[PDB]
């Protein structure tokens, strides 16, 4: 009974029949090694976009950035990454500064909560203050 370790943490007679020799020498085109390297990058899974979702205690994850400006910053990262992948100063393919007018675009951020309010104060902090307003103490 062989245990499998977990990925993550949770709670707590003659022989040599004829024709078996190796004398064929074939050079594949395209080469095997070239193809495998390309297909390794393709089979990569997609990135986790968990920004704007709650956490273990209920506080929204992510930074406090405006909804509109968050999308524009993410566009600049893609172009910068795209240029690096092609090993160029800039990339021919750009996700930012296109001719299109995407002024109304929105992207997820940690500025807003699930109820639709602002996260100027953490959700956990808001609960503690509200419940403390009703506390009573022992008489003298």
- Which of 13, 14, 25, 137 binds other proteins (CB under 8 A)? It is 25
Q: Under the criterion CB under 8 A, does residue 13 sit at the interface with other proteins?
A: no
* 47-86 residues near other proteins, rule: CB under 8 A: 47-58, 67, 71, 74-75, 77-78, 81-82, 85
Cβ neighbours of 45 (radius 10 Å): 5
Q: Are 62 and 55 in contact (CB under 8 A)?
A: no
Q: Under the criterion CB under 8 A, does residue 14 sit at the interface with other proteins?
A: no
Alpha-carbon distance of 128 to 137, in angstroms, equals 17
Q: Under the criterion CB under 8 A, does residue 95 sit at the interface with other proteins?
A: yes
Alpha-carbon distance of 59 to 36, in angstroms, equals 43
- Which of 64, 88, 97, 121 binds other proteins (CB under 8 A)? It is 97
Q: Are 59 and 125 in contact (CB under 8 A)?
A: no
Number of residues engaging other proteins in binding (CB under 8 A): 86
- Which of 14, 46, 133, 140 binds other proteins (CB under 8 A)? It is 46
Q: Under the criterion CB under 8 A, does residue 92 sit at the interface with other proteins?
A: yes
Q: Are 67 and 116 in contact (CB under 8 A)?
A: no
């Amino acid at each position: 009974m062989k245990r499998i370790p977990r990925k993550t943490k949770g709670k707590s007679p003659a022989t040599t029949e004829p024709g078996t020799s190796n004398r064929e020498q074939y050079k594949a085109r395209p080469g095997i090694a070239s193809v495998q390297r390309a297909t390794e990058s393709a089979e990569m899974p997609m990135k986790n976009n968990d920004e704007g979702t709650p956490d273990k205690k209920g506080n929204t994850k992510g930074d406090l950035v405006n909804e509109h400006s968050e999308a524009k910053d993410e566009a600049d990262e893609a172009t910068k990454k795209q240029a690096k992948d092609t090993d160029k100063s800039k990339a021919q393919v750009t996700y930012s500064d296109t001719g299109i007018n995407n002024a109304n675009e929105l992207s997820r951020s940690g500025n807003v909560d699930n109820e639709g309010g602002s996260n100027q104060k953490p959700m956990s902090t808001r609960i503690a203050e509200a419940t403390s307003a009703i506390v009573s103490k022992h008489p003298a």
